[PDB]
Amino acid sequence: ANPLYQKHIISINDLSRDDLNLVLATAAKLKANPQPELLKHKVIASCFFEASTRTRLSFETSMHRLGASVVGFSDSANTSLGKKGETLADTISVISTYVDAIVMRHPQEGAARLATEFSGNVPVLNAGDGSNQHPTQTLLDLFTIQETQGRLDNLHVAMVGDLKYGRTVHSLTQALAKFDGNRFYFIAPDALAMPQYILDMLDEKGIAWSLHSSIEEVMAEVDILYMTRVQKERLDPSEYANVKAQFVLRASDLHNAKANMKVLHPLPRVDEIATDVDKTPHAWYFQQAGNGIFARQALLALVLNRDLVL
Amino acid sequence: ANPLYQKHIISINDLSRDDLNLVLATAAKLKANPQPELLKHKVIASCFFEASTRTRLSFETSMHRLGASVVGFSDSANTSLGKKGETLADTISVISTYVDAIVMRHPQEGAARLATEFSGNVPVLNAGDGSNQHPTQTLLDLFTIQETQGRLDNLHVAMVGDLKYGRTVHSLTQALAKFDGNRFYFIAPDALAMPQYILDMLDEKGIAWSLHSSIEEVMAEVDILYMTRVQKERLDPSEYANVKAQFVLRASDLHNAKANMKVLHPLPRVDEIATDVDKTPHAWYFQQAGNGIFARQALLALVLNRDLVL
Amino acid sequence: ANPLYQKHIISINDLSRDDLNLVLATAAKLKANPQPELLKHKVIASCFFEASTRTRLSFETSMHRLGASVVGFSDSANTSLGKKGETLADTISVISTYVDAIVMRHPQEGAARLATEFSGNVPVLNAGDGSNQHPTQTLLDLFTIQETQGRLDNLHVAMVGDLKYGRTVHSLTQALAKFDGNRFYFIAPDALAMPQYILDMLDEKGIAWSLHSSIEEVMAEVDILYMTRVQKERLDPSEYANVKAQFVLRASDLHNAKANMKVLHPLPRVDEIATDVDKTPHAWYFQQAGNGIFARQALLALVLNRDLVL
Amino acid sequence: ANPLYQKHIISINDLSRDDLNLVLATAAKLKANPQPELLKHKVIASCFFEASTRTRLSFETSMHRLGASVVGFSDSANTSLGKKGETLADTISVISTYVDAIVMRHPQEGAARLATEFSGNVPVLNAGDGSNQHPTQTLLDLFTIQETQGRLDNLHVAMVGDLKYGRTVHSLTQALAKFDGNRFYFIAPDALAMPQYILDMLDEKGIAWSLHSSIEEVMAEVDILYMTRVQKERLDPSEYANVKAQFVLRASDLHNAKANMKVLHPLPRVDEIATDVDKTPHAWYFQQAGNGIFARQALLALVLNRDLVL
Amino acid sequence: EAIKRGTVIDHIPAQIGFKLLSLFKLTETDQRITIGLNLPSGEMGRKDLIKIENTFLSEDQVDQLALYAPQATVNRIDNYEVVGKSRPSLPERIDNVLVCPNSNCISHAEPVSSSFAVRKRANDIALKCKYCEKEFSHNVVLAN
Amino acid sequence: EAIKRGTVIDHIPAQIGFKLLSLFKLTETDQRITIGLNLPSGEMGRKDLIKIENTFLSEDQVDQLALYAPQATVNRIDNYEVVGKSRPSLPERIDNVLVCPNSNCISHAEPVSSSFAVRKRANDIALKCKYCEKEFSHNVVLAN
């Protein structure tokens, strides 16, 4: 079988570089040659314990693109009046008798990992567990970088915004750090700096990174400008006002950008990316979202289908 | 391709009489000879930003009757604690990379039209935008009138109820006014009269209409009695009490109705149509709802399938 | 004892011209000569089954200015044991064994009147019952007119805004119609016209009134310009915008206003009175609100004391 | 008349050292010799646009201890007519025609200051405006320090906890900086450090301050240990656990504390002060809270009386 | 006074001058600009006028002036001396500058340009929003 | 073309005259106005110029330009003679024109005019909102 057949997809730290490359290669194939009946007769649970419309639609679309059937729910409503007094363990023990795979998003860290201990031979795919992991986001990010840059090695990658609390940038950094010669530029206010443990991981690997106060300091040498939302609910509104300008992008900021440079953003971008960026050849956040379909198909295909995709 | 292939379906004022006839003819065909695999391998977004169970089930049923897959959501919950700070533009920009068509209902007028500016080559079908348009309701209404009356020309059409605020009667009037020789009877309290701009449109076209205080004034010559819900939340309860009787129908009111006359109502009818009407041969509101399936199939088929239906 | 001693205060329709004059004369006296101990040792129930912060604070302040103690509640979407099961009748039967007077506001018409049937010898004062009465607003309105104009007869009174649904303007019109020689000017869109029953009442008393589409038509002659909010909640947003301009008042409109003319508004006034009116000598809506204190004091004093030495 | 008669009390930045001393001297006098009739016949508005039970009960109790009457509201997610439409300006313009003083707490910074621009000659007392000021907390804090230490100069004051977001510690630091020879010890995680603008202000006045990572470093010298809650709401739960231990205080930590040393905390204190501190002679947070009564009485008395015979 | 080339629009009503510069971005250029305001011309309320250097405006660009300044005249300059007089007609689309008065219209707070349709009436002009499809008097639209 | 009696604002940083006209509502009068942006500028590289007749600017009003044209020159003129030239100096308070960047400040959508205390720093100017008492760099305030 293929290396990922019947494996759980929980954390980027459990996927090797060969695993990542396999998912991306499979994604490229399906994009080029769709296989609308590959997962015919599979039933997949779309379990959004925490609601996330954008991520759920992406995942369920990917299921249907391979011909699978979908059952599911979306809570976030059930919370503390009772939520569900039933353990997650029991919920999974039940649901894993119904379906062929579980895709789940949950507000507590570790939830997907816990699921695997109760799902039997039913694979669990983590669609996000608290501030921990979100590997399918990282997989579509990587696929998008590889497609637009031709490689995942020797790149200049800038990450901007809330580097402190963004699970998505933590995970992308770990992922890119599995490849060689990548250089990072971290652009964040002090209250939102890339955490020390990420920097330490880079140090062990002998990977170069530098801190920068603004985007213009490095705009002329970056291949990927990866922007993130500033969880403004964390900051004082006056504090937000004062640092806002350093993590916002507009079209005029792009004058000296390389021709190959792409601007990514896991969305929503409401504050950080002006709409005049949208029609530059650098804007690639919507194409990025579109690649979620192919990355998520590849993962479902690899995990549910014994033989590799052609 | 057929005239409607890959077109957006936003407003009745954008559909010609030939367009309307094409949708209805296609609907007649599919009713007579179902095509359960026509849209196999299409994925359609069912986007109910404003919740509407009756309209959503009708639309999603129509999608499945042609073999399409469905992803979607229903909000109305997200409102003003944040709702979604993300622009509709961005939501559509994302979703249009996932799916082959978008069916959407929204509380703001113009929302579907705005969608088309961001959906790329992905068709948008308007399932209702505020107090503006609801063209698939008008299409199932028209199909129901054509089926039961044998024509859309030279009819006597009575509309009763909240003519002021009913988008559905405004749209049906505009639609019927594209055909010839139709005569209208408007039965509404003064606070809820058919708006002047509709009357002016009829005047330019040299179409006859008259105002009537009650249903009995015209019951003996109408071919279609189209009833609407009185949005009682607008009126004072005592005001509602005092005009109530003029827009309520019971079976005994039907003594001198033509044999061919049908009573339509887009539903719910809880107040306006007594349940003793239900078993008269004139009650046709449930058959009307049933025709929503065939009108909505025809529209999806025409928009997503290059070649005309046989 | 005085004609209002131990009387219920429910409806303007139950108060004679002499009753109105007695309340107003008493209000002027307490305004000039406060009696902070008049109601010492009285306990008054402030029962807002329907919340109204402005009306409640005004009424409770009045109670304290006469030295009374206050107990009560303001109710949102709730109740403890056991209303929503317990009748209003039982609630009043209980509360009337506690207190010396009941001030109540309620969402249903007739609530205060029903209360009088269960409160024994405890006087009930209606702080508003649904779309029916609000007699202490009318008393404070009348006190303000009398104080600024020196009289309640032979006045030119314009009323502008939502005349169809404003219980406050219906009540003020009824009240003013108990005096002689008043002339009315009604300025409202057709959809929100002063109701016919009001017009009939004026006709039967030979009281002159006329419709005008603009404030400019009456400004030179008006003594009191009474503005009322637009209940836009019942209206389409498009509709509310098409006839906004007809009841908006700004400082420039007062150029040919009589020296004595006052602008009144029961408040809140957003979208109707521009803030630039506030500084003119005609703006009197805040003074009107302040007059609520003296009108409500007079009422409590008259009702709870046999004879007032003032 | 006294320097605070009819003055608004909005910001610590508007109060001089002499103003502070006057409030404190008056508080000591009323504590020793209560004047339960000082404000007889005054009516005070307790306006908590933002709910705060502890602060409201404290303030209302103060009002009653001086014999004043009280009207007001505490607001959750609501309002009657017609705030959320009606401006704060109009609300104050109304309420200031009712009452003799306005005590207000509000979620937006500057709300109390704006109120003074509309309240005419009615004094406004700020019970807290967003992340800006809370001057009566600072007054009660200062009263407690003075009462227990006998002075407000030449003190060693440690502040521990969330120094970045605590409006209470910013304000207390500003206040203490109006006196001479005070030395500060700031004990906070880097993410929650006392802001630079505070540090600059101390630098400009030649006031000594230093950072310490543990309470143990300063315990032997501290006169006042002021603990402040951690706004963990802004923080990751993992983060809140990694630096919990740095601001937790327990009885064992007080072993080498000076006999005079007091522990203060504006409350609530969960997770910071172990209950075992409560019984030590240093625990003074409940006494601090009780002192709110005398500080707030003094303020009301000074503001509402020309001259105080005490 | 005079400019060698670019454009000069004249006979702008009083207190409409600055509004054109505002609405139509009429001064948003590194190219040279000279404007005259509350200028004497003939009538008591008189006139405003504008002059723009090295830039020309299309026939469609002229037409947007209609709603505010019907009586103007746009003028091309190629050497020193004029070439052709121009007059704004009612356009079929007024885009970008107007704001839909319907508060529930999707156009508010979305990355789209406003767009309306025009038609005459007794005492006013109807404008119809591209998005909400609602129709208002210009006097309603022109007060927001 | 030149002026007999009134005020001339010269050496205005280019493309700024229009802004000055907006912020300070200088076109809201009947007096004759003459403007030039990016003009024939011997005495500059690229500058703007505004003339307003029969109207005069006090010291504070002149100082309110300091943030938008700190090297402008305001000329007072009577009987065709320039009777006084003054340069904008940093005001201590700026009202009406700026918007507080704190989104939670009470000033937004309330009937009050903005107000900021001004104090110069090495490399920028600090502006402190009268209402929320927060202080921002002028670059933050001016941004929006």
Ligand SMILES: Nc1ccn([C@H]2C[C@H](O)[C@@H](COP(=O)(O)OP(=O)(O)OP(=O)(O)O)O2)c(=O)n1
């Ligand atoms: N290099 C140039 C050349 C000419 N003009 C303009 C300024 C005047 O507006 C115009 C004058 O010519 P007109 O045809 O406009 O004068 P009229 O004939 O229109 O005046 P009137 O309408 O009173 O007859 O020339 C200019 O600005 N710059």
Ligand SMILES: Nc1ccn([C@H]2C[C@H](O)[C@@H](COP(=O)(O)OP(=O)(O)OP(=O)(O)O)O2)c(=O)n1
């Ligand atoms: N009756 C007048 C006099 C002067 N000005 C203008 C022209 C200049 O732009 C400005 C200054 O007038 P000056 O005579 O002082 O011209 P300067 O060349 O001296 O200005 P500067 O001192 O900057 O060199 O005022 C004017 O419009 N009308």
Ligand SMILES: [Zn+2]
């Ligand atoms: Zn619109």
Ligand SMILES: [Zn+2]
């Ligand atoms: Zn502010």
